[PDB]
């Protein structure tokens, strides 16, 4: 039955299946006090914004300090390189040397978001959904935790319209807008 409710109405499933591949797991490693032996300090999610392997996450998953390894949905790990890390903006860009063209999430214009729009908050995997709760930051219903922090908050078209953050206020989560990411990204390409 394509007249069935499950087929007719799992539009979030449809979005997640489309974006999961471009969402990646990031791990921050620090060196032990007087050792050459590094160990993971921070873990998070990010996503790919370019075929050759540019990746964006927030400044908490990645900070210029440490060493970063990326792991792709498929399960191959990759030493990643830190191209830029704006702390004020809470955004980070890293690059991995992948063999062949990668899958990419396009950015949506977060000024077009309408209050009430469904969005999907996704990481590495773990996915929650909700709506845009306010027209800075984008606020939302959707739970954000360590499973999806750093990862994208997307609209029903599969367009990144935020980065998930762990800031929460009275049940409401906060994400950095894609418009800040657009900005950040163009000012790095300098």
Q: Under the rule (CB under 8 A), what is the footprint of its own copies?
A: 4-6, 8-17, 20, 114-118, 120, 125-135, 139, 141-143, 145-147, 155-157, 170-172
Dig out the tokens for 23 from the structure. 């969402």
Residues linked to residue 38 through DSSP beta bridges, in sequence order: 31
* DSSP assigned state of 6: H
Q: In terms of CB distance, is 111 or 135 closer to its own copies?
A: 135
Q: In terms of CB distance, is 63 or 126 closer to its own copies?
A: 126
Which residues touch 146 (CB under 8 Å, ≥6 apart)? 43, 44, 166
Yes or no: say if 85 and 62 are a contact pair by the CB < 8 Å rule. Answer: yes
Phi first, then psi, for residue 95 (nearest 5°) are -135, 135
Minimum distance, C-beta of residue 62 to its own copies, in the bound complex (Å):
21
Minimum distance, C-beta of residue 152 to its own copies, in the bound complex (Å):
14
Q: In terms of CB distance, is 58 or 129 closer to its own copies?
A: 129
Minimum distance, C-beta of residue 100 to its own copies, in the bound complex (Å):
25
């Amino acid at each position: 039955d394509p007249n069935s409710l499950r087929h007719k109405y799992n539009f979030i499933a449809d979005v997640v299946e489309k974006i999961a591949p471009a969402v990646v797991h990031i791990e921050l490693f620090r060196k032990l006090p007087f050792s050459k032996r590094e160990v993971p300090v921070a873990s998070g999610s990010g996503f790919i914004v370019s075929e050759d392997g540019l990746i964006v996450t927030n400044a908490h998953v990645v900070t210029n300090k440490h060493r970063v390894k990326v792991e792709l949905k498929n399960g191959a790990t990759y030493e990643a390189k830190i191209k830029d890390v704006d702390e004020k903006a809470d955004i980070a860009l890293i690059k991995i040397d992948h063999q062949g063209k990668l899958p990419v999430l396009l950015l949506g214009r977060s000024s077009e978001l309408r209050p009430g729009e469904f969005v999907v908050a996704i990481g590495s995997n773990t996915v929650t959904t909700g709506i845009v709760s306010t027209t800075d930051y984008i606020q939302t219903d959707a739970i954000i935790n360590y499973g999806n922090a750093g990862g994208p908050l997307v609209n029903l078209d599969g367009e990144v319209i935020g980065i998930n953050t762990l800031k929460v206020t009275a049940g409401i989560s906060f994400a950095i807008p894609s418009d800040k990411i657009k900005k950040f990204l163009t000012e790095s390409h300098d």
